[PDB]
Design a protein around this ligand. Structure first.
Ligand SMILES: COc1cccc(-c2ccc3c(CC(=O)O)coc3c2)c1
Length: 188
């Protein structure tokens, strides 16, 4: 067939009940994740190919970067609790990977401050039980599929995107194939 298990996608041996429809995992330490955000715009291109209103969910992972990796998962919980993901994704990716000026949880807080989040607001969220449970939720979602690599996308708890099996000579073709696969998996 044109779309084949083991080419553009794989199938989880243990399908995940109740997962979000489109679920992405990333790390601010992950180089391909930087490209998915800054130059490929994978999430937006996937969104444009799915029906209006489909839930897309994006979570951070702990396994890259030791202490700071967990700090970044907690900061991503803060960003989701406050609804400021679009304000902080780029400066967090560039602080970690471009300028390497994020070395501590305080440097992470500086990114939010500079993006216009008030210090009081950030600190209250950071210490909140709502954010603790958002951290638990990110961990649970990743643990459900023993994730040991990012960037990762899962469709309906059942299918995992396989960019290894797509064409990467052309950035936009690659993005197309990826988003068209997500569309095919969602219609499955
Ligand atoms: C073609 O233009 C670009 C630009 C930036 C990153 C990538 C890229 C390639 C492969 C991958 C994989 C799978 C693997 O490791 O082969 C995951 O993310 C990727 C990003 C392509």
């Amino acid at each position: 067939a044109q779309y084949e298990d083991g080419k553009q996608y794989t199938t989880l041996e243990k399908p995940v009940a109740g997962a979000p429809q489109v679920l992405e995992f990333f790390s601010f330490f992950c180089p391909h994740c930087y490209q998915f955000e800054e130059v490929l715009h994978i999430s937006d291109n996937v969104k444009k190919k799915l029906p209006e209103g489909v839930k897309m969910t994006k979570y951070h992972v702990n396994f890259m970067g030791g202490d700071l990796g967990k700090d970044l998962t907690q900061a991503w919980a803060v960003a989701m609790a406050l609804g400021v993901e679009d304000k902080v994704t780029v400066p967090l990716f560039e602080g970690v990977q471009k300028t390497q000026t994020i070395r501590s949880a305080s440097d992470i807080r500086d990114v939010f401050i500079n993006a216009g989040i008030k210090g009081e607001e950030y600190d209250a969220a950071w210490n909140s039980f709502v954010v603790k449970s958002l951290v638990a939720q990110q961990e649970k979602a990743a643990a459900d599929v023993q994730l040991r690599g990012v960037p990762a996308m899962f469709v309906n708890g059942k299918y995992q995107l396989n960019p290894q099996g797509m064409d990467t000579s052309n950035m936009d073709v690659f993005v197309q194939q990826y988003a068209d696969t997500v569309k095919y998996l969602s219609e499955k």
